[PDB]
Design a protein around this ligand. Structure first.
Ligand code: HEM
Ligand code: HEM
Ligand code: HEM
Ligand code: HEM
Lengths: 145, 141, 141, 145
């Protein structure tokens, strides 16, 4: 579902991402910006302020895991449904996460990439990354029933 | 619904944007048309091509309304009344389209003002953009 | 935003529904769970199997609330203040889910009351269910 | 993509549908319940009231043509994207219809099937019809650029 150029645009920027630091930032802002999401991360500890969320060890650890699975999706970009099938079952069956919340994380991730890359984050690089986050959200929703 | 902390984060940030608001208004539209092509269905009388004068002029108009929203955060419905009638009654823009724009507004700001775009201001602006977009879609029957 | 004719259309339709509201309430939920399975993520504690008494019990609660709302169309925000806190602060139900339910309530009404479900009444009920959903979603952020 | 079970429920109900009746009924209700769509149909004459809309001769003929393309969608259900490619371009390039409005017409059709078929329009029957309706709406939005 991505053109050859779009793939270049995405893989091109992702190679420059600090997947360690970007993961905690994106999950952190998820919890700050859309605070209802904190309800799912109860066992992470103190989330009582933007400052507590952003320095929370568990937020950072989980953020890294979230961004590794996003990297695995970019290898398997032509079979995103297949790559995320196990994770889709988990979020449905065990975690009871409404899939609308996947769209929120994607856009927060897009905001964080724009924060880091500035002018380098073209309107056109943005578009290709919207297709990707949409594809991931859709694939995570696919095993819900 | 907003808050004293939100209002001040918005006011402080929109002070930083300053004379650039018109430029960012245009980039945000450009970003929305690019990323969300269905938004173009409401602009069929626009030359939508890249760098077009019509998109830039419209970007400025979008940025002035938002600047006036910053001054009337405590009475958005009254300050935005003409634009509510325009968007919800005359044009009938589907609310999903305001989500796309709001997002592209956030992205534009983070590109240009990384230092001001903190997790706390990010949240406040999202709250602000959605409150503006709420008022703008009110009259839909 | 309900008009004189909308409020009368609604009451009139609600009058004919009578003591069967709770049944239609339960049928409405079953249809939503079926057609839009993502709505079940908010009911992990429920036995969600077909014809279950927990869904039937809850369907009466939803119907009672709606009967409440028909009596108070002039001030839905105060009539529904407690449900409104419940849905935004405690359960945090995403707005899109209220469109799924609202849709299945119309379907349920069309199924049981074809003579009452005229083009005009259809409009008014959509408006009514739509007004309730915005009150129940108002405090979401 | 539908299973053989779903197709039978859909085809079974569709086999009993009055084309002229349901078509003008579905389109008329779209104009009535969602009055902003009337903006796209001004060369149809009197759309001033619900009874005007419902006995409007042009509304009726267009509902019929809308319903025949649903029928052709049903026959080519394994390739709706093939089936709606030309109509997709037309809605986008010529008519400028926000594809979010396709969801509304689909839901109206389902209410009109519920009206007509009553108890036989079960939740399982409905769920199948929702898949079709969502798939026709996805097919129609696909060639948007
Ligand atoms: C949209 C992209 C997302 C991706 C790629 C993703 C990925 C993951 C991964 C890799 C795990 C660890 C797997 C495991 O537990 O074995 C996980 C767990 C989890 N996810 Fe997500 N997730 C996403 C969105 C969300 C959202 C929106 C929520 C809800 C707000 C959520 C809630 C959770 C929770 C509560 C866990 C378990 C936490 C724990 O380890 O104890 N996820 N997810
Ligand atoms: C932050 C949200 C928005 C703001 C502040 C805003 C502001 C404005 C302003 C200031 C005008 C000029 C009207 C006048 O001067 O009388 C306008 C017109 C218009 N808007 Fe928006 N708008 C917003 C969202 C949207 C969205 C999401 C869409 C749909 C994609 C949209 C579509 C239009 C159209 C088609 C016009 C008419 C342009 C013309 O005159 O040719 N607007 N808006
Ligand atoms: C017409 C709109 C709705 C109305 C009038 C309504 C009404 C109600 C009422 C009256 C209660 C509980 C009253 C009580 O027993 O204390 C309730 C609770 C609840 N609602 Fe809704 N509701 C609506 C929509 C929704 C939607 C769309 C969802 C999400 C799919 C939802 C999810 C829930 C859940 C999970 C509970 C708690 C059930 C329990 O724990 O027993 N509601 N609602
Ligand atoms: C979602 C399912 C839809 C289907 C299957 C559908 C199908 C069709 C078909 C087959 C035509 C052919 C007219 C012809 O060239 O003979 C048509 C035309 C047209 N459609 Fe749709 N349509 C859908 C949705 C919509 C919606 C939601 C709107 C407006 C909100 C719309 C607006 C129009 C207009 C303005 C025409 C031209 C009418 C004329 O002849 O003047 N369509 N559609």
């Amino acid at each position: 579902f991505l053109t050859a150029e779009e793939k270049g645009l995405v893989n091109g920027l992702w190679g420059k991402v600090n997947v360690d630091e970007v993961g905690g930032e994106a999950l952190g802002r998820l919890l700050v910006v859309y605070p209802w999401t904190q309800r799912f991360f109860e066992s992470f500890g103190d989330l009582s302020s933007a400052d507590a969320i952003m320095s929370n060890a568990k937020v950072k650890a989980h953020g890294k895991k979230v961004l590794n699975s996003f990297s695995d999706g970019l290898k398997n970009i032509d079979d995103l449904k297949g790559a995320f099938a196990k994770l889709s079952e988990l979020h449905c069956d065990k975690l009871h996460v409404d899939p609308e919340n996947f769209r929120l994380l994607g856009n927060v991730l897009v905001c964080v990439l724009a924060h880091h890359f500035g002018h380098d984050f073209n309107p056109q690089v943005q578009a290709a990354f919207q297709k990707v986050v949409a594809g991931v959200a859709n694939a995570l929703a696919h095993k819900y029933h | 619904v907003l808050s004293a902390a939100d209002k001040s984060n918005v006011k402080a940030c929109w002070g930083k944007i300053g004379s650039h608001a018109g430029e960012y208004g245009a980039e945000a539209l450009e970003r929305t048309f690019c990323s969300f092509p269905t938004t173009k269905t409401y602009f069929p009388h626009f030359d939508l091509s890249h760098g077009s004068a019509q998109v830039k002029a419209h970007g400025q108009k979008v940025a002035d309304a938002l600047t006036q929203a910053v001054a009337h955060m405590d009475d958005l419905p009254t300050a935005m009344s003409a634009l509510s009638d325009l968007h919800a009654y005359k044009l009938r823009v589907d609310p999903v389209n305001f989500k796309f724009l709001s997002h592209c507004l956030l992205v534009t700001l983070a590109c240009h003002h990384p230092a001001e775009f903190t997790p706390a201001v990010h949240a406040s602006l999202d709250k602000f953009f959605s409150a503006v977009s709420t008022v703008l879609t009110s009259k839909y029957r």
